[PDB]
Amino acid sequence: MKIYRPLWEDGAFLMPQQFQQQAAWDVHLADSVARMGLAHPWGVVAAEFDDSLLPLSRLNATRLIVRFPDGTLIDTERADNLPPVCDLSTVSDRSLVDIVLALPLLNANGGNLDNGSESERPRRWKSERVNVQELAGHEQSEVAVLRHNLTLRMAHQENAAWLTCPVTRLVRDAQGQWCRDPRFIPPLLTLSASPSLMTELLELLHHLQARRQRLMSMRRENNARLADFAVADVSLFWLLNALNSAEPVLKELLDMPYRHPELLYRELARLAGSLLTFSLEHNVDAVPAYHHETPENVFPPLLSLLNRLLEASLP
Template sequence: MTMESRPLTRVVWEEGMHLAQHHFQAQGRFFEHATSFALSSLYFAGYGFSGLELDGESLLNGTVSLRQARGILPDGLVFHFPHDPPPAPLQIRDRFSPTRPSHVVHLAIPEYRAGAANTAKVDDPDVELRRFVAESREQTDEISGEETRPITFGRKNFRLILDEELDDGGPLVTLPMARIIRDGRGNFVFDPEFIPPVLRIGAVPALGELLARVLEMVDARARSLRPSGAPPEVAQMWLAHALHQSLPALRHLRETRGAHPEALYQELARLAGALCTFALEARADELPLYRHDDLGRCFGELERHLRSNLDVVLPTGSYRLELDGTGHPFYEARLTDHEVFHSGRFFLGIRGDLSVGELAGRIQRVVKVCSAEHIQRLVREAFPGLDLSHVPAPPSTLRPSTGTQYFELRKEGPCWTLMEKSGSFGIYLPDSIPNAQMELVVLP
């Protein structure tokens, strides 16, 4: 039954009427239809998961199992597992087609059929075709807290099915939940790039992680455009304007995690459209449209567009990572973009009240670099840190500061392995370098 065909007519109650179960059923349907109608009228794409957690360990054994899930189906039916009885785990080892690279698992339930039976008993032969299954539970009197009586409830008849089974077993209302692929060893795993329809950004980790990557990328580019003495060019000013205009809204979405994904799409699409002004080959009319049922592709294309066009604008630009010096003389910085960690170059710049030769020599003797989690232990136990290679003539794209000595971080050894794994930089800068100022520069 579509939203447009649902009756929104209430039951008329009057004195002396003969009550039957039909009255209460009709009244219950009226409340459900009215609530669904209101939600669909107020919110765009008001269906999807508001929370979802799957069992990755069970999947290794060929079983799809829900740990918890809550949300709204496209026809307005709400669910909350495990408060509602969850659907039975789905065995996929024998169902997974050897000729297909992936399968999508759906949460499914028979659709409501007007003028027909929608509730079955457990032992009915056609129980799989019914939307609800009658189950008796003991209910305690909420006034006295003592007397209990059996009450029959309608358990929602959910089940998990694969995409190739959508046309089996009668009309169904479904919600895509996860895509299953095989890893390099042939094990079943959930596709990390798949994003199901969701009602809030924080419903699944994939969308929040994408937002964090984009925010870090945009923030880093915005920092690289900060004035460094010379007046900025007009193009740089407009680019900085576009980036800074987006940052507060993106930070808000990341912190609250409760907004509808369409709100995130609007912010990212607005920024992507603005960047088309600076990238000659990019066109705003080629940006992906919002697809609530295909969020992974929609947001994946937006992220790739943002990354490529920021690189086009600043193909050889550098940017500085923010250093946290609250633990002086230990400093730390974070970088979650693993692609930059793998392909970029990193330079440590230090200036102080010493001659050029003395400053460079002292830096190599006393300054140590490792991961933020291990730098204090490394200094305490006098272990060697990451190798620092002095760069007397740093590249111009680094935008070097006058009087600063630059050292390139050698991407090798145990410290680099720890840094790459944790996405962190830990730096020990002792007071033996007077009035020291430090910067950590990334050259993508």
């Protein structure tokens, strides 16, 4: 909605709206900067869980760092409390369940504080009195701290009253016991948020390295220091050019995997495109399009296409 930047005046009685509006503007400003370089500046930084109570059909989060599409960053390690335990008793008939972190919508018409009064909708804010340290001196004072009213909900539930972000998926094992699905990938703000994607990404890089080292040994020497390239090496050069150009770029993205997946996608798609020139078994529509909400429909099929393209590249 509207953001009313406050004007600070000499005789003025200080109002909560002045501080609320200033804080809202700063959130919008930081979000507008993020949008200059990225199409989707929201998603999971960290989504860690305790699996110990899964045989008792209970799921607890240990660490949640998630940015919502409205620019609100939630951080249980720094500013927020962990959401209450997720009870899986209602999904005893299911084999699969998608867990979402839910943040109630901010109501521009007020009533955002969950004060225990009745409401037709969930309230975004909770107030907790915390003895907060005064940083210049040595005193502490009890201050009303803003706590986001976060809950772990399920994707099949009615969630329009909340901003939601996929945070895990649970699947039943051979015994029917709930366990976190390793194939799950949430919308990403960092690559590190998904350890399985990281394992798959490291596998691709290793496969690329092995393939390019094998292809680099296959060039005929023009002289002692220069490579010989003829009409017969049309496939050999462009393959080597594609692998040699991409490998140091992909290596630096993977060595510090704390950036947005749009950066990685761009380079992975560029490499896939370059390799498709020598394949007859694919369309060029083969490169999966980038969809932020479901990275499972972009990175696993793109890594699958790349691994197949690396193997078949020898001709």
